[PDB]
């Protein structure tokens, strides 16, 4: 399924590389214990081949989720009633499901909210923290330069 | 688990700091490693502590 | 503390380590100390002592 070098999304630290896989053990198996590494924490984890579905490390997402997330911009009616208290533990239990289309989702409600109001200080943080997530997983979707996808988001951020 | 200590450099010479009041130090680097037993990672990152 | 309470397979110990009482204790310890004491240097025999 996966070889060396490949450019694999990792839950919830987002796109990161391989090196290589060790063939370390317990009990005498030597499975395919691959090690990838990031970026974003600078840090290496090995992971056993087996459990790669289980925690849910998968492959970059093509234009078809790009544009499915393009298909999910410009369609914010959506209802939040009074308790927005409700509504930041609704898109924080998001966060920690990590789903990009819900992430995207999330991000555009915030760019209407922001574009209409204007957010508390953990609201812009959340908005902020998701949304650098979020265009990373863009910008390496398309694999192009952060500040070119942030060009992109402002024609579509509500555009 | 923890390991490697390892030292830096020192930040600034002596006489450097006994002019300017800043204390001669040097950073510690931890190399530290998480383990989930239920799944099964390492995660070696190196602490500067 | 926070091993339980926050999120499984989410966290690094980045996140898990607080290096703050530990530096707090090592500056504790070079100041305000019975054992810490200036050096008691008026001549360099009184450094030696």
């Known amino acids: 399924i996966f070889k060396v070098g490949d450019t694999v999304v990792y ?10 896989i060790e063939t370390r053990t317990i009990k005498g198996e030597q499975k395919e214990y691959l090690v990838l590494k990031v970026a974003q924490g600078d840090l290496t984890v090995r992971v056993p081949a087996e459990n790669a579905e289980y925690v849910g490390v998968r492959d970059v997402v093509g234009q078809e989720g790009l544009d499915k997330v393009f298909q999910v911009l410009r369609a914010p009616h959506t209802e939040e009633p009074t308790n927005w208290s409700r509504r930041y533990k609704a898109n924080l239990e998001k966060l920690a499901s990590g789903d990009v289309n819900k992430v995207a989702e999330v991000v555009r409600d915030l760019w209407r909210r922001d574009q209409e109001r ?19 997983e863009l910008a390496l979707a398309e694999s192009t330069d952060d500040a070119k996808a942030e060009t992109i988001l402002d024609e579509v951020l509500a555009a | 688990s923890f390991s490697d200590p390892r030292f830096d450099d020192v930040k ?30 390492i995660k070696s990152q190196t602490v500067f502590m | 503390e926070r091993m339980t309470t926050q999120d499984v397979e989410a966290i690094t110990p980045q996140t898990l380590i607080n ?31």
């Open chain 2, 12 to 41: 600034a010479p002596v006489d450097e700091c006994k002019d300017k009041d800043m204390t001669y130090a040097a950073p510690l680097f931890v190399t530290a490693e998480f383990i989930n037993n239920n799944t099964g990672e």
């Open chain 1, 118 to 136: 204007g957010l508390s200080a953990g609201e812009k943080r959340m908005l902020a923290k998701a949304r650098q997530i979020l265009v990373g």
């Open chain 1, 11 to 20: 839950p919830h630290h987002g796109a990161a590389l391989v090196e290589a």
């Open chain 3, 19 to 49: 290096i703050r009482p530990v530096v707090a204790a090592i500056k504790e310890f070079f100041g305000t100390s019975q054992l810490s004491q200036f050096m008691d240097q008026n001549n360099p025999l009184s450094g030696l002592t």
